[PDB]
Amino acid sequence: YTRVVWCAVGPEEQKKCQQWSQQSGQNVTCATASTTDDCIVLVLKGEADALNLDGGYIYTAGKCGLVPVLAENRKSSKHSSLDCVLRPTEGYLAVAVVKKANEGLTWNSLKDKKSCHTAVDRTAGWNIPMGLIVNQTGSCAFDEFFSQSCAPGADPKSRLCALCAGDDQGLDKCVPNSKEKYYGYTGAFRCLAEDVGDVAFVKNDTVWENTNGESTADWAKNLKREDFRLLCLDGTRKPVTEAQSCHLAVAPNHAVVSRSDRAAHVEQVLLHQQALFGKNGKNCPDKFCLFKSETKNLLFNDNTECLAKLGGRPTYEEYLGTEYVTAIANLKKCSLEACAF
Ligand SMILES: *[C@@H]1O[C@H](CO)[C@@H](O[C@@H]2O[C@H](CO)[C@@H](O[C@H]3O[C@H](CO)[C@@H](O[C@H]4O[C@H](CO)[C@@H](O)[C@H](O)[C@@H]4O)[C@H](O)[C@@H]3O)[C@H](O)[C@H]2NC(C)=O)[C@H](O)[C@H]1NC(C)=O
Ligand SMILES: *[C@H]1O[C@H](CO)[C@@H](O[C@@H]2O[C@H](CO)[C@@H](O[C@H]3O[C@H](CO)[C@@H](O)[C@H](O)[C@@H]3O)[C@H](O)[C@H]2NC(C)=O)[C@H](O)[C@H]1NC(C)=O
Ligand SMILES: CC(=O)N[C@@H]1[C@@H](O)[C@H](O[C@@H]2O[C@H](CO)[C@@H](O)[C@H](O)[C@H]2NC(C)=O)[C@@H](CO)O[C@H]1O
Ligand SMILES: *[C@@H]1O[C@H](CO)[C@@H](O[C@@H]2O[C@H](CO)[C@@H](O)[C@H](O)[C@H]2NC(C)=O)[C@H](O)[C@H]1NC(C)=O
Ligand SMILES: [Fe+3]
Ligand SMILES: [Zn+2]
Ligand SMILES: [Zn+2]
């Protein structure tokens, strides 16, 4: 009965979750939904217990009463002897990437260009970019800013979905789950790498993890970092090595969320599950690895070293940080005391 129901988004996450379930002796079980928002609703209804979420969704879930439980922690040498599970998270760098060969494209010449986004409502792929754009154009017509985009989660017949490809069969065009070829960090970067779009809104890590042989995938095998550039807010272009000085914002790490009343049990099971299937996990390589899924970032980002305890039992607002929270609020006035469910 000490069982946690994980919510998987889309059929691919479901498959990994089932594998996890099996390997955990059903200590973790699986529920599936077609979108992250649907998964939030399952948790709210109590039909699922938890799932790991990007900051923009943490905001959505937070307004509905869901709370941060543990955060993804990427590999970072700082805070040196403290173990990963207890090290404070640093956040990731939201960037705008373009092809080096697309010379003369800068932050100041993005209007009417083609764009690639992880999904609507996500931090680096949407909230940070569109927030900055709305800020600068003075207008809410962010839907009319780029000429075409792939923004999974938007209206499939609109220009924001025009560049989306859907699945093998061309179904599910623009669905905000991994069935959409250009969904998420890797999909948005593949969207740029295949020259479907002019700019991709992703994170620093994505560029590195999908270039210079870091990915064996076919569209990525032959990609080289020098062939790419980051767009800085001051109108300059820089090599992908300069992300610490050329990003759009620092984003709060994706984190596990759950209903307040299940938070403690979820944390307990989670800590014990990673001990088994985490980075240096007991059954990890050997049986199952929670933080691997061939660059597809299923359930968790593939670069996660561990899920770390939070600092100061933070509310969702503290977790996200005041800067980011007001930026999201300021952006959502275009489409506070809420929960759109
Ligand atoms: C941008 O994101 C990047 C990826 O998330 C960050 O770069 C990564 O930086 C870390 C240290 O902060 C580095 O950790 C260590 O990884 C290896 C040891 O486990 C080690 O070297 C490698 O050997 C091979 C190279 O021929 C290669 O196959 C293997 O993947 C390793 O890279 C390395 O020396 C280091 O001690 C990661 O390796 C590195 N990631 C990659 C894939 O390059 C970067 O810091 C981020 N920048 C910002 C601004 O945040
Ligand atoms: C674009 O939209 C908004 C206006 O450009 C902006 O919201 C404003 O953000 C600033 C900075 O985060 C907040 O600033 C602070 O101002 C002073 C300190 O300089 C203090 O007195 C305040 O306590 C506060 O910390 C503003 O609160 C906020 N303005 C309001 C009230 O809406 C968004 O941040 C911009 N969007 C993006 C994505 O950057
Ligand atoms: C616990 C602590 O001292 N952290 C504060 C945070 O509440 C708060 O949010 C953090 O903002 C940073 C960049 O502005 C991000 O690096 C970080 O991801 C984010 N915190 C977390 C844990 O997600 C910031 C801003 O008010 O101040 C920190 O001092
Ligand atoms: C399912 O979770 C339960 C409870 O968290 C685990 O049961 C015990 O776990 C503790 C710590 O690992 C051990 O001291 C006990 O030996 C476990 N009980 C027994 C008799 O197995 C259990 O390990 C988990 N099950 C699986 C298959 O992973
Ligand atoms: Fe994110
Ligand atoms: Zn910065
Ligand atoms: Zn607090």
Curated annotation (Swiss-Prot):
Binding site for hydrogencarbonate 2: 118, 122, 124-125
Disulfide bonds: 7-39, 17-30, 64-339, 84-306, 116-191, 140-334, 150-164, 161-174, 232-246, 284-289
Record's subcellular location: Secreted; Cytoplasmic granule
PTMs per UniProt: Poly-N-acetyllactosaminic carbohydrate moiety seems to be needed for TLR4 activation.
Domain of life per record: Eukaryota
Domain Transferrin-like: 4-333
Amino acids binding Fe(3+) 2: 54, 92, 185, 254
Glycosylation sites: 27, 135, 204
Role according to the record: Transferrins are iron binding transport proteins which can bind two Fe(3+) ions in association with the binding of an anion, usually bicarbonate.
Membership in a protein family: Belongs to the transferrin family.
Subunit structure and binding partners: Monomer. Found in a complex with LTF, CLU, EPPIN and SEMG1. Found in a complex with MPO and LTF; interacts directly with CP, allows Fe(3+) incorporation into LTF and activation of CP ferroxidase activity.
Protein name per the record: Lactotransferrin
Residues of the full protein shown: 361 to 705 of 708
